[PDB]
What we know:
The structure is cut from a larger assembly and holds 3 copies of chain A. With 95 residues, chain A is α/β, with parallel strands linked by helices. Chain A is 29% helix and 18% strand. The first copy, chain A, has a 4-stranded parallel β-sheet, with helices on both faces. The PDB classes it as ligase.
Amino acid sequence: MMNRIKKVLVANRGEIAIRVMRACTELKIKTVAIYSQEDTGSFHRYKSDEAYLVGAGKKPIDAYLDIENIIEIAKESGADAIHPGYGFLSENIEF
Amino acid sequence: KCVMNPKHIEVQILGDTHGNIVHLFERDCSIQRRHQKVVEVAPCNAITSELRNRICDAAVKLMKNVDYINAGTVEFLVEGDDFYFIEVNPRVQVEHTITEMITGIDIVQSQLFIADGYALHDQLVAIPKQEDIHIHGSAIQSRITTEDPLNNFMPDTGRVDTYRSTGGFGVRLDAGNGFQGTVVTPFYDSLLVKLCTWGMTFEQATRKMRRNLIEFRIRGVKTNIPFLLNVVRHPDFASGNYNTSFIDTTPELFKFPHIRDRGTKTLRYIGNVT
Amino acid sequence: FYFIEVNPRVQVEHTITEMITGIDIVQSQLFIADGYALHDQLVAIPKQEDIHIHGSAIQSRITTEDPLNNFMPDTGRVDTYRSTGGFGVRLDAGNGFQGTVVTPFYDSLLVKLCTWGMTFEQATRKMRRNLIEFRIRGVKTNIPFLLNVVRHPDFASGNYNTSFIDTTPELFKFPHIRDRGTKTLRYIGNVT
């Protein structure tokens, strides 16, 4: 159904993360959540096919602004695309 | 120049990598508390089609001019029959939900298709030509948070021991950290669930928002529901004539009924004797 | 086409009609019974010519009927009940809430799940996702069967008839569950 997006890393948390994951699943796209230490129990993490801790060691907001670690996770998981939702890195040129 | 008593009105855009650009009409985000959005409504029922179409066409023009790709929003201020650009959010927004509800178009699915190289009007993507994109009814979104209105809107924290939501016709729910057993932390937004209601008219959608807000049971933390209810029941809201200053200049909205917590007190008694 | 029956009442599946026309049928029943006319401004039902189809909607009733046991309704405490949402999703709860006790005396219905899309295909993608996203523990449900129906290409096509289910035995083959969670808990339970 898709062309080259077989898997998507959702680089966010909370409500919008879940929103993106649902859309992905409806399109037969596999999903990867990320979550900070402090969001270990957040329910967005339960809605993805896969999930990874992001930003170990960083303060809580910084954890979802960790560009390098997010990319590592995308690469290591074989994600074709990253949806940044809103806030966090969604408007970040560097990212 | 600090415009007097404006309506904050936003237009939704989608562009593909093949030069197609399309708007999904507008949203009224005038209802704000100290400049942060509280309740959002679509379409804006207090403007003429004529003016709606000038604003949308302007948004499309700006985004065609830059060859904008994927989802984006163009924000304006509206004073009488005049409108002024203020901002572009080059991203999906919290309040995309209501636009989906009044047009039929799945915005987040549309972002994925677009990023995979499809065209808006590919059969799989199914977005109609501009002329065939219509408004169906009216939708309102309320964000339910743990911001306690009785404590300066400071977000409450802790375990959500009871979380029960609602449903039925015209109700949409998009969960955040609202589920029974979750632990709200102080580090991120408080958002528990976005509640959206739809009707063939704004009035019909308003009745539903009222019911649904009342029907929610959330125990273990405080929420902003008492405040949303005040907003949604206020006759200025029902009228459709409010603007940026509505909340800040309507102090009735900050008077709250006394909680009935007969249940909780009864349990303390039973607990104590037991 | 041939008449067979009138149901002089609201029906289970009114939900999908509300979704594709915009008209709240149950509110309409109340207005009518109070003496209003269909087209009173408050009742807001349009003239026949102005009543249109908007998209397509599907309803699935989620029950405790166990497909692996002859569709006998299961009973007991629903220890986990977690539903779904997002765009195009409607839920009308019956006795589905976390902590409820399903009894054998009445219908098994836990929740009616409905999805909508501008096309049937769009609505179908949503029904699939939502059915899978549901978590219900403590009783068996008919979700495995609904998924089979909803994934079957005859369903996706829109060409099925009264005999579809009864003559499609693939619909009654179910994946074996990997209940890795549950097993892991038994181990942890046992050592503890």
